[PDB]
Design a protein around this ligand. Structure first.
Ligand SMILES: O=C(COP(=O)(O)O)[C@H](O)[C@H](O)COP(=O)(O)O
Ligand SMILES: O=C(COP(=O)(O)O)[C@H](O)[C@H](O)COP(=O)(O)O
Ligand SMILES: O=C(COP(=O)(O)O)[C@H](O)[C@H](O)COP(=O)(O)O
Ligand SMILES: O=C(COP(=O)(O)O)[C@H](O)[C@H](O)COP(=O)(O)O
Ligand SMILES: O=C(COP(=O)(O)O)[C@H](O)[C@H](O)COP(=O)(O)O
Ligand SMILES: O=C(COP(=O)(O)O)[C@H](O)[C@H](O)COP(=O)(O)O
Ligand SMILES: [K+]
Ligand SMILES: [K+]
Ligand SMILES: [K+]
Ligand SMILES: [K+]
Ligand SMILES: [K+]
Ligand SMILES: [K+]
Lengths: 322, 322, 322, 322, 322, 322
């Protein structure tokens, strides 16, 4: 097949984390399959069906842990596939794909704003919120509370290795919101002054567990220790279907040099391995609520979300396999 | 009034953390009083005594949290004050200062070795040990356990903001000990593969609480969650006598530029505040044993140590006070 | 505009807690709309509709915390609004109001009986049951379990400030049930001899949290400490629909004179403040089952109840709104 | 009244535990109803109906605790009863019984194989797994996982008093899976090396609680204590419908001679009572997942399995009742 | 013997709680034996030795739970007894007793002030302290913090049945300290805003447990749940010797009419018992520190306090028995 | 080198558990050293010294886990050694051995009777008590309490694999104390009716941990879970001095044939390993008190027993060493 440069570029930028955050990655992936259909030179349906099957594969093998990614691809390709198998002519298939992808992206933007409006009602005036990493969903909650005239402060953890915390700090500060920036080690120390914890998700499992940025389970643990509510702001497409049938989520191991720079690590002894997991898994008992765009749920209700929105596709193969 | 430059240099090097770690700061301060006494140009005992008090005050107003520092000064200065008030001539006072300093330095070095011999018996063949910061006492234990031919592997947390973990990592590696280097956020993610936690202490309170490097309480917290033994390696001069009479330990807040470099930090808006606590406080429920030069205690026996060795001095003011 | 006195009287009697308990306040409000509709002098459907909305608003602005109240009003008013907008004549609208009110009252009475039949199966011969406040639903369970010939004994907490326990105590005593009457402070002291806890609920949230009489969370807390089952007896109209979209329940602060009588309270200085929260919030981890007219659920299934029966109305404004 | 001898043999063998394990009991009760229809010499439909009703009672009154048994009889008799009331002639009734028994028995075999497939994905390479009793569903998970190439090892608790663990230890060994065999009391001592716990269920309640072999809750508790996953492998017919309406599962007390043999117990004084409860009840807070043949759920979702597969039957009486 | 009216009056006032609080009761008891020696008309030593033996017995059988009482008596009578057995003439014995009692009372007043100075160092500026009952020791801590210019607020629980909270509220408010008065049920509700808990003791056991006013264990439980420090301000004479040798402290049951007034309770049904325990027992794990006048200790160190101050008298009988 | 046959018989019987229970082992080892001195045909002092050293090694190398054994040998041999070095002649050395054995053996009997007296005060009328294994100290507490008139009942866990619980069940019955006998696995199921837990100890560490029969920690854990007191009845010679200097207690692994009999185990495949640990280790957080013959302590005070009765010996080598 013949793939546009924007599919390859998006894939490179996902791997390299130049494009990041699970929501954004998912949009970008959908935006890429969309450009593959805008610019395709295919002459018959099957040509295009193949181009999109292969673009999807390229995009799926970028970063494993956030299921937002394959859900975006599935949203586009369940539709694209059903068009092709119902003999849609070429231009019918091109629109299915473009339009499916415009839907997903639009709904993504809609879901986040909505998560913001819902989750803000759980923020009280004077609250001190602790967050982790950079999460567009968590930030929608925090930003919306602030706009309601609640007087909040946000404790931003710096989030090693990759410093996502700086993005979070600067962003919140530019909306007017007072920020307190601390190291990830300082979470328990400052949990006493924290009223709420608000974080994102990359994958939510059938049984309620939240895969999110490494260190998430620690902040959640000590929030529980102190009875601070842990609220996970997370779209429906963050929920992981394959977990319904027994699958464990893959925990992405990133390059050691994100931790110790190349210039330095090459000088270190050989009997030191550097391990850089990108995510950990917080158990549901440490979670108060998941704020989805369909409303507040307890974490154990993740399986209802999956039953009714994702269950069907499990008896089928992936809509890009052959 | 006529203080030598070695005193001034030590003070600067303790502030800047060029000289660092609780035990070594203690030794560096004994040492500084030693050099003050050795090089003094005083001709009257009253005049040397004055120098030693002023030097003590300078060394004391460097870093508050590690109680080892004022315990080192006290060890020297109780003995110097008793000699002075007993009517000692110049040269007898000069030697009390010097010889006391030397007693302390020698005792500190012996205590760490002994702590290693004692702690290492609680390490078992095959153990995976998680540690935090750079602690000579913690390292003595791991070091010795390896020398005994136990095959151990040490998980080393990077310890932000100042990166003390790099020191620990390279040091353990240098003795032959395999290391796994993780960011602080990953401590819960890797506690399932950890068999023991072994950290040091800056101060230990009357009720058994351990003030140590920021993040220590989190590691202890999830170690408890998992039933991993938390062993604190600590000399008796880590115990905090003022806490017997209700004093809380001051937690050092250090330069924000440690967290976010100056060059970057000036580009940030007013409404972000960087907060840099260098320590936190781990409760005694989360600590299995404290390993001292006199043996293994439960954290609650911290009061015994304080009683039998430090309490006698609490009726008197500080031996460097006018 | 032309509101009968029965509406005004009910409102006053709900405020003063002459009429009280979540379920009975709900019935008293249906009933009040019923009498408004029965006695209306309106000649146009638009005019009755106006009366019913104004009456609803008056009944709603009485006490906030028990969600039963606005669920009772909604049950009537959804049906009255659909009939009105469907073009009903005066007498058809009058009967929709009356007959809906009656449906609710009848359903409330049936639900409590059914809750008793269901809950009582979880009581066993010889049980010592601790309760709190006066809850008709809780009492239905204890009542029925005794009628089944189980020899039960009920520990009754006095329930300050308003002494609801006296009602419970005398009521249980009147059916033949032995009572042990303790102050609220003794709940932990007597939890070792307690086999079951059975309390009611004013509101129950989307994540399974139970808002109930002040002190409920303490009893639940130490019941958990001891592994005593905490069973919440509660009708479906206790479930809080606004919480599905992130609303927190308002906790009523009531007159300080309830706590400290007026006569005494005026002799106290400015700088004492009496605070009288009438409710508190028990987390779902501390609740074994919720017993509803439809059966036994785990607290987390509170969302199911809300979804299948209340969620449909959250896109529309309140059925008494202009 | 004309009951075939196969029915009486099944009943005897269920009572004396020659046939045992919740699923195998279910299949054996269905098999007996099947053999009753095949071998019946009934000339009228009404006459067969009476034999099956009566067989269903003989079988139900064997061992009470595993709901699998009554759920098997319900499966057959619900259908046999709906035929009989639609006026089915004799050979139509005989077939409804025979075929319903056959679907239940095939669906049982299918569910367990599929549990094995689903549950094996939560087993990771290297895993050490503790189990308890002998569960065909637990064993399916362990066996599949091994067949996938995962080098596992299984800790088999011996399971007093009836020694179920010997059956488990021989079986798993016979597939080439290395077994560690231990006494029940040693579960906590070896929970530190255990990665995963996998057990069966006899009945699962509406609120998530799991009834299973005596000891199961002790193992669940120490596994929670050590953050080891407890995974319950249970067919959907192990869920207990009566629990929806408040019922408590009866805990079978079996012969004391299973504990102390008869020749020894005869000599013991009267003032020693030997209590042999065959089951206990684990809270859902100590359960990570239930692995059913329709997927992985959190324990709290047991109510959904029940609501949608069994709730319908509750408003009627038992199909084998008059 | 012939006992002065002040021994009988003090005893009546202890029983009736007109004189109350464990410290005060102890002083008053000592003050009474003192007046029995001031006013005695005895002519020989043995006469007076008998008068004081019998006065002591009268005073001991007033209220059981606070050991401050018998420790006061023992302080006076261990001395008085050793005088008499070393043939002290009459006037020697009269002074021993008077002077012993003046010592105890003076030291009591000294210990409380001291407990105040120590415990205040654990109060931080801005703190919100929750307390319970009326405790002179707890109040010494709170008052002293306030005098140091710390800006505190105290949550006073009302303390049923006897309303000791009103005494506490009014007293603290008259020293200038802002008070928030709440019911005992509201403790968990307001534990989120509380920074510290400070309470008294009536008896402290060998193993660390604190007997204090009913409801104390509840406040401590939820303080632990929220990681609020529980600080028990308690003199050395609050520690219970008999617990060293296995004794459980008697939990005083007071008259039911303290709960339900006479006028009301006589009208209540016969199958309602009212139980009024005056104290409960908080376990040591819920206690951070005991502030004694000899300094801060962990609760497990209570046995050291008893070993060294009370151990000796245990091999002997009580100094008023014969 | 001339070792009497009584020594070899004691050693055999300790190894095969014909003599068992930590205290009874101690008495039997002392008895053997006693019979060695009595029957020795040694002509020089040096010759007897060698026989006792050698007997002490034979006895020490039987069963490692109960420190009672080495503490008995230490008791004798410390004294025998100090005599030998003061130049004691032959019959003086023979007597030091004989008498030291006799004091240890009488002090053992006295300690257990006194443990019984002290511990029985923590048993209240009506109490149901769970125990484990067969402990002579635990049994002293249960027996005394019964003799005081307290109507108790005892739950005897059976204690696999060696069936110790049968010995306990017969014994207590023989004193007229009603026994409930159960399998080990049923400890949690019956912990709800248990009021008190009372067990022995084989070794108690410096930090409070209790080593005792396999299962003891499972029972301690579920007792903590249900807020039931765990009371450990232990003579002061059960405290382990080596633990002060970092030692870990060795956990004896006994024959697999104790678990599965030899005639059965021979048939089992090789890929089943049977592990029979005879002890486990309970944390001090799950222990309410240790009841020694010098009083009730919290588990954390084990270090004081040790410091002041055993610490002296640590700087030397074993008295029976060269
Ligand atoms: O874990 C991360 C970032 O992962 P990375 O930075 O490694 O991509 C975020 O908290 C979630 O992805 C949610 O973000 P959002 O709510 O914006 O989807
Ligand atoms: O917290 C630190 C060092 O802080 P810093 O790096 O700020 O001095 C170490 O864990 C202890 O001080 C122990 O040191 P040691 O065991 O070496 O005495
Ligand atoms: O908290 C209360 C009453 O508050 P108040 O006395 O302030 O109304 C009751 O526990 C519930 O409302 C249950 O009532 P029921 O079960 O009777 O509906
Ligand atoms: O407790 C038992 C059976 O006990 P018993 O031996 O008393 O019947 C098993 O764990 C379950 O029945 C599940 O087994 P399966 O998964 O094989 O149904
Ligand atoms: O329990 C009470 C009062 O008992 P009562 O009011 O029943 O006498 C107090 O908290 C303690 O006695 C300590 O008070 P103090 O520190 O003043 O001794
Ligand atoms: O675990 C055992 C003995 O096991 P074993 O049977 O293996 O020796 C007993 O609980 C203790 O030794 C205490 O007994 P006592 O109090 O009688 O010393
Ligand atoms: K907080
Ligand atoms: K571990
Ligand atoms: K109980
Ligand atoms: K483990
Ligand atoms: K707080
Ligand atoms: K109990």
């Amino acid at each position: 097949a013949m793939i546009v440069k924007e599919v390859y570029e998006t894939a490179e930028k996902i791997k390299s984390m130049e494009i990041r955050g699970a929501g954004r990655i998912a949009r970008a992936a959908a935006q890429a399959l969309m450009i593959q259909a805008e610019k395709s030179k295919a002459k018959e349906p099957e040509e295009l069906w193949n181009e999109l099957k292969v673009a999807s594969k390229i995009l799926y093998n970028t970063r494993p842990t956030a299921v937002s990614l394959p859900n975006a691809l599935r949203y586009v390709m369940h539709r694209v596939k059903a068009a092709y198998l119902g003999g849609a002519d070429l231009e019918t298939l091109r629109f299915t794909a473009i339009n499916s992808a415009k839907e997903f992206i639009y709904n993504s933007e809609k879901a986040i704003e909505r998560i913001g409006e819902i989750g803000a009602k759980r923020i009280e005036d004077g609250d001190i919120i602790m967050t982790h990493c950079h999460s567009k969903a968590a930030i929608s909650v925090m930003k919306k509370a602030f706009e309601q005239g609640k007087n909040i402060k946000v404790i931003v953890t710096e989030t090693r290795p990759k410093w996502q915390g700086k993005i979070t700090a600067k962003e919140l500060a530019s909306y007017g919101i007072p920020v307190i920036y601390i190291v990830d080690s300082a979470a328990r120390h400052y949990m006493k002054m924290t009223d709420k914890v608000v974080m994102g998700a990359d994958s939510i499992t059938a049984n309620g567990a939240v895969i999110n940025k490494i260190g998430t389970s620690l902040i959640a643990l000590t929030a529980k220790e102190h009875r601070v509510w842990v609220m996970i702001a997370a779209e429906t497409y963050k929920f992981h279907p394959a977990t319904m049938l027994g699958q464990l989520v893959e925990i992405e191991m990133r390059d050691p040099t994100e931790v110790i720079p190349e210039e330095e690590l090459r000088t270190w002894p050989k009997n030191i391995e550097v391990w850089n997991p990108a995510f950990d898994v917080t158990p549901p008992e440490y979670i108060d609520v998941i704020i989805t765009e369909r409303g507040i749920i307890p974490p154990y209700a993740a399986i209802d979300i999956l039953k009714e929105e994702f269950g069907w596709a499990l008896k089928y193969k992936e809509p890009w396999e052959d």
